[PDB]
C-alpha cells in the first residue's frame, strides 16, 4: 500500500496501486545533444541514457571547454574559453518525452478524518500518454528521492515508473478498438446465420428479469440502432433509437437500465439531474491551471457512440432539458458561451426511465 | 511531523488550547491517528531557523518535541476468541 | 571602428536647423511674424506652450519654392523623426528668445523666478570668468580675435546651467490639415486618422494621428525629468536626468570640486529646484466603425505631458496626434524573444469631435454662424425638426428633446439648497415609433451623451466601483454611465424592463443629482448632473384604451413626478399618415437623405455651438409672467383633482410640475437668446405639457 | 476534486459515501439536505457507486455502503392521519430504497 | 560559404524554373507593389514578400529535397528562401526585404495535433490544426537601431538577432544598445530610422470537436513575425505550418540549475484560419470564371427564385415559403448608414413557431450548415452574457478585457436559436437591442463600449400549450411580447394538420429519402463521418451542375457572389407597390399573427432588396416588391 | 553547421581509388602484371618496400586515352 512506503524501499523496485489525479504535459528531455564552444568552436556530443532525475541536472553541460584536456590537435592553438562556454545546436540534438503523473491511494480505503496521501511519478519514452487521469493502476517503479528548496534533512519521495498496468480500461471513442481477429469474425458470421438469433438475443437481455419480452426486444433494437444517413444537402438522419420506460415502482426498469449499461460497449448510467459530481449533457468549464475553456464532462458526450441510461428522467433541469432535446434529434450539443462556440457530437441512444405522478399509474 | 494540542477537557476556561509540534522518528511513524488522546515522552528543544523572525523583532525561537515514546491513553480475534 | 558601423542618410541636421531658424524668424501668416509674437508672449510669461503648425512649415516651403530658392522637405522630416525635431525646435527657439518687457514681480510663478535666477547666475559666471581670465594677462598683447578666443575659452571652461533647465515653455506639434494638403498636392501620413490596429511597428518614431474613444484617464502626477541635488560641501547643484520609469538616486557628489577632492560631499534632493512634468496616462480604444468583423476592440496608451494635461476625459471621441515611441518591455521574462518593446503615443495635439459646452467661447468666427442662424428665423422649429431629419413626424417630441439638450437654469439659494435646472424626458410608446432612434440621435448630438440598455447596465455599472489604478498606484472610484454622462444626457433605453437597483439610483439622480454609496468599500457621495432621457413600453407592450393611462404606464408616482415631460407615443393606424410615413421612409432608403427639400437641416456641429451659446444665457422672470405661471399651476391642480376619479387621469398635479414648467420656459427663453422669460415661452411650455399626454390620448 | 489553497495540491475526495465502502454511513438530519447531497445519496443507493467528472478526472468510485439515516417529520410531528410520504420531505424513489 | 547550401540553392532554382506559378506569383507581388508605389508618387497596400509553396509539386520534383524540408527544415528552408530571394532580385533590376516561404499540401505523419505533438517531432516541419485560445499583443521588436552622433554628425546602426528569427542556431553574441560611439561621443536614438518587426505569440489548443471529452486539453505556443501577425483571433480554428523548435538550455547551465525542460514552440510559417461549424471564421470559396458564368446564367432565368429556394433542403417536404424566407435572409438586404450617423437595418430575421416534429430544428441545422458564418445557440443553454459579451481579467496587463458572445462573434452572419421561448428575461432584453439597433452596448464596472452585432436571427419556438390551436387567438398561442414579434420580419406558424394525401406525400418523401447511398459506397457499408474544415480565402439526389435542382456547394457560391457583388437600390415602381401594400396591411380588418408596426415597412424593403440579390440586379423592380409583399402576406395571413 | 562549412573540389577519391586498383592489376610494362608480381614478392617476405613509379601511372593513363 501507499501508506506502507518506508525508508527501506528507497532506491528499490516497488509495486503499488492507486488512482491517478493528473497527467502533466509532455516535457522535452535531451537524449543526444550536440554542443559547440562559443569562441573556441569545439564540437562535442553528450549522450544521455538516464532520465530518472527530478529537481536537478544529473547530466549537464561541461563547466569548461574540453579542447585543452583532449589535446586533439598537435598544433594546440594563455587562452581560456570561459565558464560554461558551450551552446546547444538544437537542429542536431535528439529529445524524448517525459511526463509527471500524480498517484493517490484509492478513496475507498482512507482514514475517515485524514487527507489522502499522494506521490509524484515520472515516466518517459513509451510510458508517457498511456493512462488518463482517473484510471486505477498498479505501477512498478523505483522509489527515489529529490530535494526541494521543515526539517534540516528532509527529502521529497517520488516514483520513477518502470511499468504501468491498467486494472480496468475506460470506454470511449479513442479507447475503442476496431481491429478484429479472424476467429471472432468467423464466430460472428456463424452466429448471424442462426434462425433463432432474435430469440437468443432477447433471452440474453437480462435473464434475471421475469417478463417484459417486448421491452427486451426494444432494448435489442436500441443496442443495434438504425442506419444513419448523410444526404447531399448536408442534413443528417439519425440511426440511434431512444426508448422511454415509464411505469410503477418495482417493475425492474432500473435493472434494465443497469444491464444495458453493462452490455453496451460504451454506456453511462446517470440520473435525470446528473450524477454526484458528473454532469449530464455537456459542461464547459475553465481549465484549472491555465484558465481556458474546455469540455468538463457530461453523460451525453462521454457516451458518444453508446447509450445513456437516464433514470428518473422526469426530474431534470431546464439546461439539461434543452440539451437533451438537441441531443436526441440532432445528436449534437451546441455550446455558445462568452468565450467558446462549438457544435459537438452527441451520437448517443437514450434509454430513459420514468415513474408517473401520484405513485402508481392511474388508468382514469 | 505531528501537531499536538492540549486536550479540550483540561484547558482552563478563558484560555485557548496550546499546541506544540512533535517529530516522530523511524519506528514511531504512523502510530497515532489524529483525533485521539495520546501521551508523548520526548526531548523538548528549539527548532533553528534562518535569521530568526523578522515580524517579531525579538530573538525568538520555535520549539519542537522529538518523540522518544508514544503511548495511547481493535477488531482482532485470537484462537480463543473464535471459540468464544 | 567597424563594431559600430555607419550608414549614409538623406537627412542633414545642419541645413534643416538653418531652415528652422529661417522659418521661425521670417514666417508671416496672411504684429509682425507669428512665431516672434508667440515667443514674445512666452518671454513675458503670458504663454506656456509653443504650438508649431505643419501647415505653416508647408506654406513656408511653398513661398520658398515660388521664389525659386531650394528648400528641404522639413515637414516629411518632422513626420518621420519628430522626437529629434522637438529639441531641434527647442534649440532654435532658445537661440532667438526675446527679452521680457515686463519685470519680474511677487505675483510671478516660482518656476519662473527660479529660471530668472538661473539665467542671471549664468551671466554672473560668464562675466566673472571673463574678468579673471582678462586680469591674468597671459600674453600681454587684434582685439576682436582676442575677445572671440577669450569668449570661447570662458564658454568651454565654465559650467553653466544648461538650456534645458531654463525652458518655461512646452513645445508641441500640430499636424497638417487635410484641406491644406489638398490645396498644395501634399500627401502626409500624419493627417489621416488611423485606428489602433492600423498603427503597426513601422510607424514608430513618426508623428501619427489616432481616432478613438478615451476609456481611461489617470490623475495628473509629477513625473520627474531631471533631479536636482544640493551639496553642502561644495555648493554645487547636481542634476541627473531621468528617462525611465524608475531611477537610482545619487549619494556622492559628482561635481568637479568634489570629484577632485579627497572628501566627497553628500547630495540632498531639492524638489523645488528639480524639473517635473504634469503626467497623465490615457487609454484610447478604436470606434465600432473601425473594429473589423467579429473582433474585440483593443487599446493604445497615450502619454500626456506638460500643458496638454486634463484635455482628455473618458467618453470622448478624439483625434490625438502624437509621436509613436517605444518603451522597455513590460511582461513576463520567459515570453520575450528578443528586444520586445511596449508602445505609447506621446501626445502633441488633441482634437475633440464633440466640443464641450463649457469649452465654448464667443470667438469671431462663431458669431457670424450664430447670427446667420438667427437671421434665418424660426430657430426653435428649425432646430427641432433637424434633430432626426430622417425620422418622420414627432415634432413636439423633437421640440422637447431640443429643450432636453438645452435645459433650464440651475438655481442656488443662500440657504444652501439647490434646485436642478436639467430636464428629464420620458418617451413611452408602442413598438416601432422610433424612440430608440431618437435616443441615439439625442446622445449622439450631445457632447457628453451615454446610451444605455436597461439590462445592459447593472447596479455597479451605473453608480460606482472601487478599483486600483497602477500608474498612480492608488485605489480609486470609477463611475458608471451616470458619471460618464455628468453634465450631459443619459439615454436609458428599455426603461420598463430594469431592476430595482438601477431604478433607485436613477430615482435619486433625477432629484438630488448625486449618488450616495455606503458599502463595504466606500462611504461617499458623487456628483451626477445628468439630464435623463428614458425610453419605455407600456405594461403589456402595447397601449390599450380599456385601462387608465396610469394603469398601463406601470410607473410609480414618485418617479413619474420626477419626469418633467412624458410622451405617450401611440402607434394609431390611419390611411393618410401611414402614406406619408411610408413615403418618408422609402425616400430615406432610396436617396440616403431626408425627403423634404424645402428646408436645410442644421449640421450637428452648428446645433452644438448654438446650444452652447444658448446655455450661456441665464433668463429670469418678471412679476406678470410669474403670475401667469401661478394661475396655470392653480388651474392644473384643480383639473388634476377633478380628473382623479375618472379614467382619464395621467396622475396628480405636483409642485415638480410647476418647476418643470419653469424649466421648460427658461429653456425656451434660452433658445431665443434672451435674459427674460416671456409670456409666449410659458404658452409653449404649457402647450408642450398638454400635447405630451392629453392630445394624443384624447384623439 | 479540491485544491488546497496553501499546498496547491489537487486531491480527490470520495465523500462520506465512498469513504464508508464496506461499512456504514450515518447521515444525521436527512430531511434538510441540499440537492447535490440528495443526488449523491440517490446514486449511492442505486448503483452503489459514485461517478465523478471533475478537473480532468472521469472515474467511478465504489460506494457499497449501508445507510442509517435519521430524519424529523414535517412540522415537527408525525401525523398518523397522513401517510408517510406526506410527513417527510423525501420523495418516493429515495423513500423506497 | 557552404557547398551544400549552394547545392540546395541551385536545386531550388531548378524547382522554381520548372514550375512557373511561383515565378509569376513573385511577378504579381512585385508589380502590385510597384504600381502602389507609383500611385503614391503620382497621386494603398503592400503585399508581403512570401510565396505559398505546394509540397506535392516539390515531392513530384525532388523527393530528397521534399523530405529535407519536412524532416530537417533548418538545413533546407534557408537555401530555398535564398533561392526565392535571388529569383525575385533577378527580375527586380529593371524596376530589399528577404523573401519568406510558406507551405501547403499533404504533410503525411506531420499533420498533427497539440496532443499528438511529442518530442520526436522536434526540429521538424509540422502542420498543427487546433483552436486559438490566447493571442498576445502585437509587439514591435527592434532589429536595427539607428543612432546619431551630433559632435561628428554621423549616423551609426546596430543589428540585433535572437534565436527565434533564425532556424539554424548560431553563437549568441549579445551586442548591447549603443549609447556612445567608439570615440566617446553621446549617441541620440533615431526613432523612425530604426526598424521594428511585429511579433506575436498565440496559443493553439486542440479543437473541442476532436478532443477527448473529459481530459484536460493540450496546448502549444506559436511565434509569428511581421506578415503573419493579426491573422487570428481567439476562438478561431486554425492550421499552423511551422518548425517545431526547442530553445535555450533546459537547466543544464550553472545559472539555471528547474524542470521546465527545453522550451518548445512553433516558428509559424503559414497560418490558415479554417472555417468550422458554429465558429467565428466565415467560409469563403474561390469563384472561378466558369462558376461566375454559371451564376450569371442562373440569374437570367425567370424561375430563379423558385429553384434556389426549392434547392435549399430537398429532404424536407413542403415548407416552401420558409425556404424562400431563408434564402432572402441569406441574401441579407442592404444596410443603410445615414450621413448623420443614424443606422438602418438590412438583415432579415425569421421566427418559426408551431407543432412539434415539423422540420424546425432540421431547418435551423441546415442554416447552420449552409451559411458562411452561422452560430448555433439554444434557449436555456446560453445566457445574457453568453450571447452578447462578458468581462474577464488579463494576466499580463492586469486590466479587464472582453469576451465576445454569440451575437458579437456572428457579426455579418446568422444566429440560429433553438427553443427561443425558453430564454430568460434578461437574455430577451439583450436580444431587443441586437435585433433592431444591431449593436451590443455594455457598461460594466469600468468598461463602457459598444460592439457590432449585425446579425440575422432565425429562431424556432414552441407554443405554450405544446400545440397550436386554430380557434384560439395567436396572442395566447405564441405568448411572446409584441416588441419581439415586431423585431422578427417573418413569423411562420407551422401546423401539423392531418390529411390522408398529405400524410402519404410525407411517407413517400421520407421513405425515398431514407433509401440513399453516397457514390462509392456499398449497399451495406455504413457511412463514415468526416469533420468539415474548409479553408477561408481572402426529392431527387442527382443534382449535378443545375440539371433541375441546385447543389448546396453551388448555392453557397451563388450566395457569396450575390452578397459581394450586387448592392441594389430602390426605384419608384417598387416604392409605389411597397407603400400601397404597407398602407393596406396597416388598415386591414383581418386578424393577423404578428402586429403591423412601422418595422414591417422596412421589412418589405429588405425583402424586396433580398430578391434583387437573387436576380443579381442593381435595381429593385416591381416584381421584387410584389414577391416581397406576397411572401409577407402568407406569413401574416 | 556553419562553423565548419564545405567547399567543392575537383578531386574525387572514389574514382581515383578505383583507378589505383585498376592500375595495380592491369599495368604491364613493355610474368603477368608488374605490381601483382611485386605484391607476391612482398607476401612471400622477399620484398619489403613497394615503389610506385609515376612514369608507370602516366603510361597507364596514356594507354587508356589511346
Ligand atoms: N419482473 C421482475 N423480474 C425480476 N426481478 C424483478 C422484477 N421486478 C422487480 N424485480 C427486482 O426487484 C427490484 C426492483 O427494483 P427496480 O424495479 O429496478 O426499481 P424501479 O422501481 O424500477 O425504479 P424506481 O421507480 O425509481 S424505485 C430489483 O432488485 C429487481 O431485480
Ligand atoms: N416615425 C417614424 N419615422 C421614421 N422611421 C420610423 C418611424 N417610426 C418607426 N420608424 C422605423 O421603424 C424602426 C423603429 O425602431 P426603434 O427605434 O427600435 O423603435 P422603438 O419605438 O424603439 O421600438 P421599441 O424598442 O419596441 S420601444 C426603425 O427602423 C425606424 O427607422
Ligand atoms: N416537412 C418535413 N419533411 C421531411 N421531414 C420532416 C418534415 N417535418 C419533420 N420531419 C422530420 O421530423 C424529425 C423531427 O425533427 P424536427 O421536425 O426538426 O423537430 P422540431 O420540429 O421539434 O424542431 C426530423 O428528423 C425530420 O426529418
Ligand atoms: Mg428506479
Ligand atoms: Mg427601442
Ligand atoms: Mg426541435
Ligand atoms: Zn573552447
Ligand atoms: Zn559637492
- Nearest listed ligand to the Cα of residue C537: 2
Ligand 1 pocket residues where CB is under 6 Å: A 209-211, 249-255, 355; D 93, 96
Neighbours of chain F (3+ CB pairs under 8 A): A, E
Alpha helix (H) residue ranges in E256-351: 289-299, 304-310, 320-331
Rounded CA gap, E537 and E273, in Å?
9
Buried b (16+ CB within 10 A) or exposed e, E334-348: bbbebebebbbbbbb
Query: Based on the domain organization, do E129 and E255 belong to the same domain?
Result: yes
Resolution attained, angstroms: 2.9
Buried b (16+ CB within 10 A) or exposed e, C229-258: bbbeebebbbbbeeeeeeeeeeeebbbeeb
Rounded CA gap, E362 and E369, in Å?
10
Could you give the angle at which helices E622-636 and E598-614 cross, rounded to 10 degrees?
Answer: 130
Which residues does chain A have within 8 Å of residue E529's beta carbon, measured at their own beta carbons?
A: 230
Binding annotation of A for ATP: 247-254
Residue C119: φ, ψ to 5°: -65, -45
Write the CA distances from C309 to C170, C306, C358, integer angstroms. 12, 6, 17
E357 marked as part of a ligand binding site: yes
CB-ligand 2 contact for C569 (6 Å cutoff): no
Mutate to test the pocket of ligand 2, among C434, C455, C497 (most ligand atoms within 8 A of CB): C434
E-F CB pairs within 8 A amount to 14
Alpha helix (H) residue ranges in chain A: 67-70, 182-192, 197-204, 213-224, 253-263, 299-302, 318-329
Rounded CA gap, C305 and C350, in Å?
12
Handedness of CA E330, E333, E339, E341 (dihedral sign): negative
Q: Are A171 and A265 in contact (CB under 8 A)?
A: yes
What is the distance in angstroms between the Cα of E376 and the nearest Cα belonging to chain D?
A: 26
Binding annotation of C for ATP: 392, 432, 434-436, 537, 562, 656
Record the cell numbers describing residue D62, joined without a space: 465504489
A291: nearest CA in chain D?
Answer: D55
| D53 interface with E at CB cutoff 8 Å | yes
Rounded CA gap, C663 and C308, in Å?
37
Q: Are A353 and A315 in contact (CB under 8 A)?
A: no
Rounded CA gap, E425 and E338, in Å?
32
Protein residue whose Cα sits closest to atom 24 of ligand 2: C431
Rounded CA gap, C640 and E128, in Å?
76
Query: Based on the domain organization, do E218 and E270 belong to the same domain?
Result: yes
Beta strand pairing call for C489-493 and C450-453: parallel
CB-ligand 2 contact for E189 (6 Å cutoff): no
Ligand 3 centroid – CA E213 distance (Å):
29
Residue A215: other Cβ atoms inside 10 A? 20
Write the CA distances from C202 to A180, E34, E196, integer angstroms. 61, 19, 6
CB-ligand 3 contact for E261 (6 Å cutoff): no
Amino acid at each position: 500500500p501507499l501508506r506502507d512506503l518506508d525508508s527501506e524501499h528507497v532506491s528499490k523496485i516497488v509495486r503499488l496501486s492507486g488512482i491517478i489525479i493528473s497527467t502533466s504535459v509532455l516535457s522535452s528531455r535531451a537524449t543526444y545533444l550536440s554542443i559547440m564552444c562559443r569562441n573556441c568552436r569545439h564540437t562535442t556530443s553528450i549522450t544521455i541514457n538516464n532520465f530518472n532525475s527530478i529537481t536537478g541536472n544529473t547530466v549537464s553541460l561541461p563547466r569548461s571547454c574540453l579542447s585543452t584536456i583532449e589535446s586533439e590537435s598537435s598544433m594546440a592553438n594563455k587562452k581560456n574559453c570561459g565558464p560554461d562556454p558551450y551552446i546547444i545546436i538544437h537542429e542536431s540534438s535528439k529529445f524524448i518525452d517525459q511526463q509527471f503523473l500524480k498517484l493517490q491511494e484509492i478513496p475507498e480505503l482512507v482514514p475517515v478524518g485524514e487527507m489522502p496521501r499522494n506521490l509524484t511519478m515520472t515516466c518517459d519514452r513509451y510510458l508517457t500518454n498511456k493512462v488518463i487521469p482517473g484510471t486505477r493502476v498498479t505501477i512498478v517503479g523505483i522509489y527515489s528521492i529529490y530535494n526541494s528548496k521543515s526539517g534540516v534533512a528532509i527529502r521529497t519521495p517520488y516514483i520513477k515508473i518502470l511499468g504501468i498496468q491498467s486494472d480496468v480500461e475506460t470506454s470511449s471513442i479513442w479507447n475503442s478498438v476496431t481491429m478484429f481477429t479472424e476467429e471472432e469474425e468467423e464466430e460472428f458470421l456463424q452466429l448471424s446465420r442462426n434462425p433463432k438469433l432474435y430469440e437468443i438475443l432477447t433471452n440474453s437481455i437480462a435473464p434475471s428479469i421475469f417478463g417484459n419480452e417486448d421491452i427486451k426486444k426494444a432494448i435489442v433494437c436500441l443496442l443495434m440502432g438504425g442506419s444513419k444517413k448523410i444526404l447531399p444537402d448536408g442534413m443528417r438522419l439519425r440511426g440511434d433509437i431512444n426508448v422511454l420506460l415509464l411505469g410503477d415502482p418495482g417493475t425492474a426498469k432500473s435493472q434494465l437500465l443497469k444491464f444495458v449499461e453493462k452490455v453496451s460497449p460504451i454506456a453511462v448510467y446517470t440520473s435525470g439531474k446528473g450524477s454526484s459530481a458528473a454532469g449530464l449533457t455537456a459542461s464547459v468549464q475553465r481549465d484549472p491551471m491555465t484558465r481556458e475553456f474546455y469540455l468538463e464532462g457530461g453523460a451525453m458526450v462521454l457516451a458518444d457512440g453508446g447509450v445513456v441510461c437516464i433514470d428518473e428522467f422526469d426530474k431534470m433541469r431546464d439546461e439539461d432539458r434543452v440539451a437533451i432535446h438537441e441531443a436526441m434529434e440532432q445528436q449534437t450539443i451546441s455550446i455558445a458561451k462568452a468565450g467558446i462556440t462549438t457544435v459537438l457530437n452527441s451520437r448517443t441512444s437514450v434509454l430513459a426511465a420514468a415513474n408517473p405522478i401520484y405513485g402508481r399509474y392511474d388508468d382514469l | 511531523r505531528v501537531t499536538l494540542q492540549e486536550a479540550p477537557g483540561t484547558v482552563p476556561p478563558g484560555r485557548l488550547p496550546r499546541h506544540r509540534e512533535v517529530i516522530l522518528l523511524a519506528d514511531l511513524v504512523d502510530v497515532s491517528k489524529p483525533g485521539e488522546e495520546v501521551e508523548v515522552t520526548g526531548i523538548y528543544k528549539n527548532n533553528y531557523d534562518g535569521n530568526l523572525n523578522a515580524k517579531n523583532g525579538f530573538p525568538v525561537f520555535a520549539t519542537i518535541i522529538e518523540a522518544n515514546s508514544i503511548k495511547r491513553r481493535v477488531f482482532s480475534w485470537t484462537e480463543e476468541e473464535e471459540r468464544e | 571602428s567597424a563594431a559600430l558601423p555607419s550608414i549614409q542618410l538623406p537627412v542633414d541636421y545642419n541645413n534643416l536647423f538653418n531652415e528652422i531658424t529661417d522659418f521661425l524668424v521670417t514666417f508671416k501668416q496672411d504684429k509682425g511674424p507669428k512665431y516672434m509674437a508667440m515667443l514674445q508672449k512666452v518671454a513675458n510669461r503670458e504663454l506656456n506652450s509653443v504650438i508649431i503648425d505643419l501647415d505653416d512649415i508647408l506654406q513656408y516651403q511653398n513661398e520658398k519654392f515660388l521664389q525659386g530658392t531650394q528648400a528641404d522637405d522639413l515637414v516629411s522630416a518632422i513626420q518621420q523623426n519628430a522626437n529629434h525635431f522637438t529639441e531641434l525646435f527647442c534649440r532654435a527657439i532658445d537661440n532667438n528668445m526675446p527679452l521680457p518687457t515686463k519685470e519680474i514681480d511677487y505675483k510671478d510663478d516660482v518656476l519662473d523666478v527660479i529660471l530668472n535666477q538661473r539665467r542671471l547666475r549664468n551671466e554672473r559666471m560668464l562675466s566673472d570668468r571673463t574678468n579673471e581670465i582678462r586680469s591674468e594677462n597671459l600674453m600681454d598683447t587684434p582685439p576682436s580675435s582676442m575677445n572671440d578666443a577669450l569668449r570661447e575659452v570662458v564658454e568651454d571652461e565654465t559650467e553653466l546651467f544648461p538650456p534645458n533647465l531654463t525652458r518655461r515653455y512646452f513645445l508641441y506639434f500640430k499636424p497638417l490639415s487635410q484641406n491644406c494638403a489638398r490645396r498644395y498636392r501634399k500627401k502626409a501620413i500624419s493627417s489621416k486618422p488611423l485606428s489602433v490596429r492600423q498603427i503597426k511597428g513601422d510607424f514608430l518614431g513618426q508623428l501619427i494621428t489616432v481616432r478613438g474613444i478615451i476609456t481611461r484617464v489617470s490623475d495628473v502626477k509629477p513625473a520627474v525629468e531631471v533631479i536636482a541635488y544640493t551639496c553642502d560641501q561644495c555648493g554645487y547643484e547636481v542634476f541627473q536626468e531621468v528617462n525611465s520609469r524608475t531611477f537610482t538616486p545619487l549619494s556622492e557628489c559628482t561635481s568637479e570640486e568634489c570629484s577632485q577632492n579627497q572628501t566627497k560631499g553628500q547630495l540632498f534632493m531639492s524638489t523645488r529646484a528639480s524639473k517635473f512634468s504634469a503626467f497623465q496616462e490615457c487609454k484610447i480604444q478604436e470606434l465600432s466603425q473601425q473594429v473589423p468583423v467579429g473582433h474585440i476592440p483593443r487599446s493604445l496608451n497615450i502619454h500626456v505631458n506638460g500643458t496638454l494635461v486634463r484635455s482628455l476625459s473618458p467618453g470622448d471621441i478624439v483625434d490625438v496626434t502624437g509621436i509613436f515611441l517605444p518603451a522597455p518591455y513590460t511582461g513576463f521574462k520567459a515570453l520575450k524573444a528578443g528586444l520586445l518593446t511596449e508602445t505609447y503615443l506621446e501626445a502633441q495635439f488633441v482634437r475633440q469631435h464633440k466640443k464641450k459646452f463649457a469649452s465654448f467661447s464667443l470667438t469671431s468666427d462663431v458669431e457670424e454662424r450664430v447670427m446667420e442662424l438667427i437671421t434665418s428665423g424660426d430657430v426653435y422649429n428649425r432646430l427641432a425638426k433637424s434633430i432626426a431629419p430622417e425620422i418622420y413626424g414627432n415634432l413636439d417630441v423633437k421640440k422637447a428633446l431640443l429643450l432636453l439638450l438645452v435645459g433650464g437654469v440651475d438655481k442656488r439659494v443662500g440657504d444652501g439648497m439647490k434646485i436642478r435646472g436639467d430636464i428629464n424626458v420620458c418617451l413611452m410608446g408602442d413598438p416601432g415609433v422610433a424612440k430608440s432612434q431618437l435616443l441615439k440621435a439625442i446622445c449622439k448630438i450631445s457632447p457628453r451623451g451615454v446610451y444605455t440598455t436597461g439590462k445592459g447596465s447593472s447596479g455597479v455599472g451605473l453608480t460606482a466601483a472601487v478599483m486600483k489604478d497602477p500608474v498612480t498606484d492608488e485605489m480609486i472610484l470609477e463611475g458608471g454611465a451616470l458619471v460618464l454622462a455628468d453634465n450631459g444626457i443619459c439615454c436609458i433605453d428599455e426603461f420598463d424592463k430594469m431592476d430595482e437597483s438601477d431604478r433607485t439610483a436613477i430615482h435619486e439622480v433625477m432629484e438630488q443629482q448625486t449618488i450616495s454609496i455606503s458599502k463595504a468599500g466606500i462611504n461617499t457621495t458623487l456628483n451626477a448632473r445628468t439630464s435623463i432621457l428614458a425610453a419605455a413600453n407600456p405594461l403589456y407592450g402595447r397601449y390599450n384604451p380599456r385601462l387608465s393611462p396610469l394603469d398601463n404606464i406601470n410607473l410609480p408616482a414618485a418617479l413619474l413626478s420626477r419626469f418633467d415631460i412624458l410622451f405617450l407615443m401611440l402607434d394609431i393606424p390611419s390611411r393618410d399618415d401611414d402614406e406619408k410615413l411610408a413615403e418618408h421612409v422609402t425616400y430615406v432608403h432610396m436617396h440616403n437623405k431626408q425627403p423634404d427639400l424645402d428646408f436645410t437641416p442644421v449640421e450637428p456641429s452648428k446645433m452644438r455651438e448654438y446650444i452652447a451659446y444658448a446655455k450661456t444665457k441665464r433668463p429670469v422672470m418678471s412679476e406678470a409672467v410669474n403670475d401667469y405661471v401661478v394661475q396655470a399651476y392653480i388651474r392644473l391642480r384643480q383639473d388634476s383633482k377633478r380628473e382623479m376619479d375618472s379614467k382619464f387621469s395621467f396622475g396628480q398635479a405636483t409642485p415638480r410640475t410647476l418647476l418643470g414648467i419653469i424649466r421648460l420656459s427658461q429653456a425656451l427663453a434660452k433658445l431665443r437668446l434672451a435674459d427674460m422669460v416671456d409670456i409666449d415661452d410659458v404658452e409653449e411650455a404649457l402647450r408642450l405639457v398638454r400635447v405630451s399626454k392629453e392630445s394624443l390620448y384624447q384623439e | 476534486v479540491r485544491k488546497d489553497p496553501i499546498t496547491k495540491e489537487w486531491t480527490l475526495e470520495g465523500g462520506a459515501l465512498v469513504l464508508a465502502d464496506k461499512g456504514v454511513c450515518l447521515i444525521d438530519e436527512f430531511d434538510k439536505m441540499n440537492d447535490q447531497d440528495r443526488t449523491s445519496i440517490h446514486e449511492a443507493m442505486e448503483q452503489q457507486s459514485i461517478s465523478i467528472s471533475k478537473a480532468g478526472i472521469v472515474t467511478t468510485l465504489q460506494a457499497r455502503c449501508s445507510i442509517i439515516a435519521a430524519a424529523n417529520p414535517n412540522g415537527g410531528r408525525y401525523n398518523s392521519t397522513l401517510p408517510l410520504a406526506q410527513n417527510v420531505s423525501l420523495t418516493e424513489p429515495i423513500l423506497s430504497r | 560559404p557552404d557547398a551544400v547550401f549552394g547545392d540546395r540553392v541551385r536545386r531550388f532554382q531548378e524547382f522554381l524554373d520548372t514550375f512557373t506559378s511561383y515565378r509569376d506569383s513573385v511577378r504579381s507581388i512585385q508589380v502590385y507593389n510597384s504600381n502602389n508605389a507609383a500611385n503614391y508618387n503620382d497621386d494603398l497596400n503592400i503585399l508581403p514578400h512570401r510565396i505559398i509553396i505546394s509540397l506535392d509539386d516539390l515531392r513530384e520534383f525532388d523527393r530528397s529535397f521534399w523530405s529535407g524540408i519536412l524532416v530537417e527544415p533548418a538545413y533546407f528552408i534557408p537555401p530555398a528562401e535564398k533561392a526565392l530571394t535571388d529569383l525575385a532580385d533577378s527580375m527586380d533590376d529593371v524596376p530589399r526585404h528577404p523573401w519568406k516561404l510558406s507551405f501547403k499540401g499533404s504533410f503525411g505523419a506531420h499533420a498533427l495535433s497539440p496532443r499528438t505533438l511529442t518530442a520526436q517531432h522536434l526540429n521538424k516541419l509540422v502542420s498543427v490544426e487546433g483552436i486559438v485560445t490566447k493571442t498576445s499583443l502585437v509587439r514591435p521588436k527592434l532589429i536595427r537601431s539607428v543612432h546619431y552622433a551630433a559632435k561628428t554628425g554621423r549616423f551609426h546602426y546596430r543589428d540585433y538577432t535572437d534565436a527565434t528569427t533564425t532556424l539554424t542556431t548560431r553563437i549568441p553574441t549579445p551586442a548591447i544598445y549603443p549609447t556612445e560611439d567608439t570615440e566617446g561621443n553621446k549617441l541620440t536614438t533615431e526613432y523612425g530610422y530604426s526598424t521594428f518587426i511585429d511579433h506575436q505569440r498565440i496559443t493553439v489548443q486542440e479543437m473541442p470537436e476532436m478532443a477527448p471529452a473529459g481530459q484536460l486539453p493540450r496546448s502549444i505556443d506559436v511565434i509569428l513575425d511581421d506578415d503573419l501577425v493579426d491573422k487570428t483571433k481567439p476562438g478561431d480554428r486554425v492550421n499552423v505550418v511551422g518548425v517545431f523548435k526547442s530553445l535555450g538550455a533546459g537547466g543544464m547551465n550553472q545559472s539555471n540549475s528547474t524542470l521546465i525542460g527545453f522550451k518548445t514552440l512553433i516558428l509559424g510559417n503559414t497560418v490558415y484560419p479554417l472555417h468550422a461549424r458554429s465558429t467565428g471564421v466565415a467560409a469563403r470559396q474561390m469563384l472561378t470564371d466558369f462558376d461566375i458564368r454559371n451564376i450569371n446564367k442562373l440569374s437570367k432565368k425567370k424561375d430563379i427564385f423558385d429553384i434556389l429556394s426549392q434547392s435549399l433542403a430537398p429532404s424536407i417536404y413542403g415548407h416552401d415559403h420558409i425556404k424562400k424566407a431563408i434564402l432572402l435572409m441569406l441574401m441579407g438586404g442592404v444596410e443603410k448608414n445615414l450621413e448623420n450617423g443614424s443606422h438602418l437595418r438590412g438583415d432579415i430575421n425569421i421566427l418559426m413557431v408551431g407543432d412539434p416534429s415539423t422540420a424546425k430544428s432540421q431547418l435551423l441545422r441546415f442554416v447552420l450548415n449552409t451559411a458562411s458564418l452561422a452560430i448555433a445557440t439554444t434557449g436555456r443553454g446560453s445566457s445574457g452574457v453568453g450571447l452578447t459579451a462578458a468581462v474577464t481579467t488579463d494576466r499580463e496587463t492586469g486590466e479587464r478585457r472582453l469576451e465576445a458572445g454569440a451575437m458579437v462573434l456572428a457579426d455579418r452572419g446568422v444566429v440560429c436559436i433553438d427553443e427561443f421561448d425558453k430564454m430568460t428575461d434578461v437574455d430577451r432584453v439583450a436580444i431587443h437591442e441586437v435585433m433592431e439597433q444591431q449593436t451590443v452596448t455594455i457598461a460594466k464596472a469600468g468598461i463602457h463600449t459598444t460592439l457590432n452585432a449585425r446579425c440575422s436571427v432565425i429562431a424556432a419556438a414552441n407554443p405554450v400549450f405544446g400545440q397550436y390551436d386554430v380557434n384560439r387567438d395567436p396572442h395566447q398561442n405564441i405568448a411572446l411580447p409584441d416588441s419581439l414579434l415586431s423585431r422578427f420580419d417573418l413569423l411562420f406558424v407551422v401546423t401539423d394538420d392531418i390529411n390522408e394525401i398529405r400524410d402519404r406525400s410525407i411517407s413517400e418523401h421520407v421513405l425515398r429519402t431514407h433509401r440513399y447511398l453516397p457514390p462509392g459506397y456499398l449497399e451495406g457499408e455504413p457511412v463514415r463521418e468526416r469533420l468539415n474544415l474548409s479553408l477561408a480565402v481572402g426529392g431527387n439526389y442527382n443534382g449535378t451542375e443545375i440539371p433541375k435542382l441546385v447543389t448546396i456547394p453551388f448555392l453557397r457560391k451563388y450566395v457569396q457572389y450575390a452578397k459581394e457583388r450586387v448592392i441594389p437600390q430602390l426605384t419608384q415602381e417598387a416604392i409605389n407597390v411597397i407603400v400601397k401594400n404597407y398602407t393596406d396591411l396597416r388598415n386591414d380588418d383581418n386578424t393577423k399573427k404578428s402586429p403591423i408596426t412601422a418595422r414591417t415597412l422596412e421589412t418589405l424593403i429588405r425583402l424586396a432588396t433580398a430578391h434583387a440579390k437573387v436576380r443579381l440586379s442593381k435595381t429593385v423592380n416591381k416584381v421584387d416588391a410584389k414577391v416581397a409583399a406576397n411572401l409577407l402576406r402568407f406569413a401574416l395571413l
